[PDB]
Design a protein around this ligand. Structure first.
Ligand SMILES: CCOC(=O)c1cnc2[nH]ncc2c1N1CCO[C@@H](CN)C1
Length: 247
């Protein structure tokens, strides 16, 4: 038996009457695919799925008492570089896992990155997720989704696109936010001046000016317009800043 303590955001915090264990309960009244995908998942950097009950659908998910990464980002400032690097390491671990089982999240942003009691990052909310690889066969995506400031430019420009580079791009936007406390552009389109400036290498402007040359060098490889030229995760793991001892 579980008591519903408070509304988290619908999602409610539930506490076990006997054990006092806490869990997040998602109430819905597409949910079928979210449960299906959640049943595939098992990784320390992905919100745990405990099960579901049908009545109004109920999803039981890992409660992350640390809240959202979003709330650890000080506006216009960001966070200490060592904290950002640690969070970025854990984000990559989670994303590598998902891509490894052929799943793309499609909406990576600080609001969907939760923290447990130890500040361990957990990828959250698979309502927009989809399978991009099955029976070792890649499937190109063609539906536009995600969140504009975080979406890769190809999603706005091409009919079809590879799933993995899209997630890599969004991860680069998250890193920018962690290091500068602001988003670089409303969207990565040619009509967007801020994106034009970036493509023209005007890193003497914000937010790039607040970012140290080492992490900035990594962002130069992630925020590349051509998804085929964009750095892959295995190569991100070889990046100099990625491997820099910090703090
Ligand atoms: C301390 C605040 O941490 C949360 O609330 C929170 C904790 N664990 C969760 N697992 N799945 C979601 C979730 C969660 N929420 C759900 C509602 O939206 C977000 C909070 N405004 C994040």
């Amino acid at each position: 038996d579980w008591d519903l303590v408070q509304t988290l955001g619908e999602v409610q915090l539930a506490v076990n009457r006997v054990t006092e264990e806490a869990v997040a309960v998602k109430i819905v009244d597409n949910i079928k695919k979210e449960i299906c995908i959640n049943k595939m998942l098992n990784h320390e950097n992905v919100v745990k799925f405990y099960g579901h009950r049908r009545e109004i659908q109920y999803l039981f998910l890992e409660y992350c008492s640390g809240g959202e990464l979003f709330d650890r980002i000080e506006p216009d400032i960001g966070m200490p570089e060592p904290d950002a690097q640690r969070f970025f390491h854990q984000l990559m671990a989670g994303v590598v896992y998902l891509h490894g089982i052929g799943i793309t999240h499609r909406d990576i942003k600080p609001e969907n990155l939760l923290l447990d009691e130890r500040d361990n990052l957990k990828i959250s909310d698979f309502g927009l997720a989809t399978v991009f690889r099955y029976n070792n066969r890649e499937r190109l995506l063609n539906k536009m989704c995600g969140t504009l400031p975080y979406v890769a430019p190809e999603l706005l420009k091409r009919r079809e696109f590879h799933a993995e580079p899209v997630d890599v791009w969004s991860c680069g936007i998250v890193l920018t936010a962690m290091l500068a406390g602001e988003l670089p552009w409303d969207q990565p389109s040619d009509s967007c001046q801020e994106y034009s400036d970036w493509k023209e290498k005007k890193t003497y402007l914000n937010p790039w000016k607040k970012i140290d040359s080492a992490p900035l060098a990594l962002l130069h490889k992630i925020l590349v317009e051509n998804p085929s030229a964009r750095i892959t995760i295995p190569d991100i793991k070889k990046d100099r800043w990625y491997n820099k001892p910090l703090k």
